């Protein structure tokens, strides 16, 4: 029963159980399973900062650019929650550095929103659109300025 196995894979990934992810994978569960809202094991592993599990999902062919019904991707989640190593890797495996979610946010908007310096650096390195605009016509520049961190706005010009 793949459903049960998929739900088991999702939780183990989110929970950072290296060993367990190995048992489900070597035992048939789909690395590309989804929940009711289109979340995949990679989304959850990138959200929670589980690096080694991110590596093993990609090696076995998990889609690096999977999106939920709100248009969220693993790169969105890793950048809002401050997981740099995971950002580094995602991009190495081809993550779309300029994907937009439902609110019209990119991973640049998102790193600005919770104020990650080192993650803003890597994104501009990999071609992030410093003039991308969200549903409300705002940039990652406008944002950090609203929030009062001039230095970031300085680097995000």
């Amino acid at each position: 029963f793949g459903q049960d196995l998929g739900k088991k894979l999702l939780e183990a990934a989110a929970a950072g159980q290296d060993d367990e992810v190995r048992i489900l994978m070597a035992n048939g569960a789909d690395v590309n399973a989804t929940d009711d809202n289109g979340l995949t094991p990679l989304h959850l592993a990138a959200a929670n900062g589980q690096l080694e599990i991110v590596e093993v999902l990609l090696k076995n062919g998990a889609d690096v650019n999977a999106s939920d019904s709100a248009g969220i991707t693993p790169l969105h989640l890793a950048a809002y929650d401050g997981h740099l190593e995971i950002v580094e890797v995602l991009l190495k495996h081809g993550a779309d550095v300029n994907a937009y979610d439902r609110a019209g946010w990119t991973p640049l908007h998102l790193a600005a929103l919770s104020g990650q310096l080192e993650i803003v650096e890597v994104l501009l390195k990999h071609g992030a659109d410093v003039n991308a605009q969200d549903a409300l016509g705002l940039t990652a520049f406008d944002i950090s300025i609203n929030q009062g961190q001039e230095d970031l706005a300085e680097i995000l010009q």
Binding site: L44, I72, Y80, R102, W105
Partner: protein, 138 residues
């Protein structure tokens, strides 16, 4: 890292803690490893009416546990969230249908699609237990 993502003051925090007793707790569970467990214990122990929400359980800490928020018979005032950031923001919408006054994001649960959706009053990156201890605790 425990820095408030909301901009309320603690007069604002004392208020919600103080006027609201009806609490939906999302992501509730029997596991001790889950922070939701201890916090529910602590709320129940300090006069709150707490209804656990988790479709993977019929029951939690000796309380009927519900599949969804929509599922709760009586009124709820505050929705207390213990789920993944890829997930929590979806409860803003349900709270609004329920007629709740507050949505509370515990640590590592917030994602900004939640502002775009929001009553209501949002609390983000704080613990209901710790704020209580600090503001009202003996």
């Amino acid at each position: 890292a425990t820095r408030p993502i909301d901009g309320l003051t603690d007069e604002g925090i004392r208020e919600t803690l103080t006027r609201y007793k009806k609490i939906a707790l999302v992501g509730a569970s029997p596991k001790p490893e889950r922070d939701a467990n201890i916090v529910m214990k602590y709320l129940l122990e300090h006069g709150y009416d707490v209804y656990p929400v988790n479709p993977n359980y019929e029951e939690v800490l000796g309380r009927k546990c519900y599949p969804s928020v929509l599922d709760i018979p009586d009124k709820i005032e505050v929705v207390d969230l213990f789920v993944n950031p890829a997930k929590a923001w979806r409860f803003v919408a349900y709270a609004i249908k329920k007629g709740a006054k507050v949505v509370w994001f515990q640590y590592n649960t917030y994602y900004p699609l939640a502002a775009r959706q929001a009553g209501l009053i949002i609390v983000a990156n704080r613990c209901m237990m710790r704020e209580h201890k600090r503001l009202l605790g003996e």
